[PDB]
């Protein structure tokens, strides 16, 4: 009960972190857990409609907060709903350029290293590398 109340207050902005650190998705995931969104959504159902709407809106905004400011400026120009596809296309284009620049095997190794650093599932990395390879030809 305390965890959900604290999360609701934090997202609403009533209570900030100890050091007034920005309320980003990464920090929340670090503290509350990987699936904070699911548990928060389940808990919100036990609250009036206004609080439910506020929780949904705050969750959506926090999810948008998962990109750096530069990425949002470059890719979120034409709306947030189209942000994910634009960012994916830009990343795929960067991958294609890297492949055409410095081969494939080195590209495979680099993608593996970045996935290790970027906290990506092996399935997602495999899908990304296959998609860029298919885009090349």
């Amino acid at each position: 009960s305390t965890k959900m109340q604290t999360l609701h207050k934090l997202l609403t902005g009533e209570v900030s972190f100890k050091n007034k650190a920005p309320v980003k998705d990464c920090n929340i995931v670090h503290q509350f857990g990987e699936n904070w969104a699911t548990e928060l959504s389940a808990y919100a159902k036990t609250l009036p409609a206004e609080q439910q709407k506020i929780i949904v809106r705050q969750i959506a905004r926090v999810k948008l907060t998962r990109y750096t400011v530069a990425e949002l400026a470059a890719y979120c120009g034409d709306g947030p709903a189209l942000l994910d596809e634009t960012a994916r296309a830009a990343n795929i284009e960067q991958g294609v350029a890297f492949v055409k620049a410095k081969g494939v095997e080195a590209f495979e190794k680099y993608v593996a290293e970045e996935s290790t650093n970027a906290n990506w599932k092996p399935e997602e990395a495999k899908k990304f590398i296959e998609d860029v390879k298919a885009k090349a030809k």
Binding site: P22, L72, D78, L82
Partner: protein, 268 residues
């Protein structure tokens, strides 16, 4: 007969071509569309980069184009823009901080920066008074490198605002950016000192809201529209056509931008 001036600042050719097609198809040829690098009125600037001849970089949240996520929000983000020199020459925002370290005299540069900050602060206080807010939020990057431009920015902005009678709250860049993206209803008027990070923050806010057109106030006196994406450029062109005195065409462009962001030209 009439003329719309297109300024290109770091924009991909696709966006410029889309803007030209939109204006040609909507206007119908009554108003011509010329390209240049500087203007004072009837001007649309395309691209993230800041054009030459603009001193204020205001942006709002238009009611019509509010994204469902950001419905009801009302916060004005005004970025102070110092005079821009040629790309090769050293920009004022960097000269004002490097010459002091090197010991070179910094009198004329300080004077120019003071004039620009005074104009930007006047614009910000006017907006705040119109909206009715009592306090404005200054945004300064807290890096050690920018320890002179931000100091002057604060010293002048707070002076002018207090002379006008409103209160100022200084803050850094990361905290204000996160608050603006997550909880923007707690900020009424936010001024931004002239730094690259502040420009990126302004672009991020203008995009996350759903795509809007940024207003630039120039030295000659006037307002020129600015966009960086298909929807933002379409909205900027719609506002420009409205200013020229075209209501139905502006409404059509706005509706097309709302419906089909990336392919407005074909949509309308």
């Amino acid at each position: 007969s009439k003329q719309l001036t297109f300024i290109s600042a770091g924009a991909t050719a696709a966006v410029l071509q889309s803007a030209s097609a939109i204006v040609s198809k909507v206007a119908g040829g009554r108003v011509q569309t010329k390209t240049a690098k500087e203007a004072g009125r009837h001007a649309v600037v395309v691209g993230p980069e800041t054009p030459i001849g603009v001193h204020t970089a205001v942006t709002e949240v238009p009611k019509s184009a509010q994204d469902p996520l950001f419905s009801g929000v009302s916060t004005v983000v005004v970025r102070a823009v110092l005079p821009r020199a040629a790309p090769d020459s050293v920009q004022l925002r960097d000269a004002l901080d490097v010459y002091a370290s090197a010991g070179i005299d910094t009198k004329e540069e300080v004077r120019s920066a003071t004039e620009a900050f005074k104009k930007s602060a006047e614009v910000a206080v006017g907006k705040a008074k119109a909206k009715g807010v009592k306090r404005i939020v200054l945004v300064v990057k807290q890096a050690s490198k920018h320890n002179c431009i931000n100091e002057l920015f604060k010293k002048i902005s707070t002076e002018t605002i207090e002379s006008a009678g409103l209160t100022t709250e200084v803050v850094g860049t990361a905290a204000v950016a996160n608050q603006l993206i997550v909880n923007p209803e707690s900020l009424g008027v936010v001024l931004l000192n002239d730094v690259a990070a502040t420009e990126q923050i302004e672009l991020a806010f203008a995009g996350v809201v759903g795509g809007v057109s940024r207003v630039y106030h120039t030295v000659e006196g006037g307002k020129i529209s600015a966009g960086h994406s298909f929807k933002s450029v379409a909205l900027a062109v719609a506002q420009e056509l409205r200013e020229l005195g075209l209501s139905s065409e502006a409404d059509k462009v706005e509706a097309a931008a709302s419906k089909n962001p990336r392919a407005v030209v074909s949509a309308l």
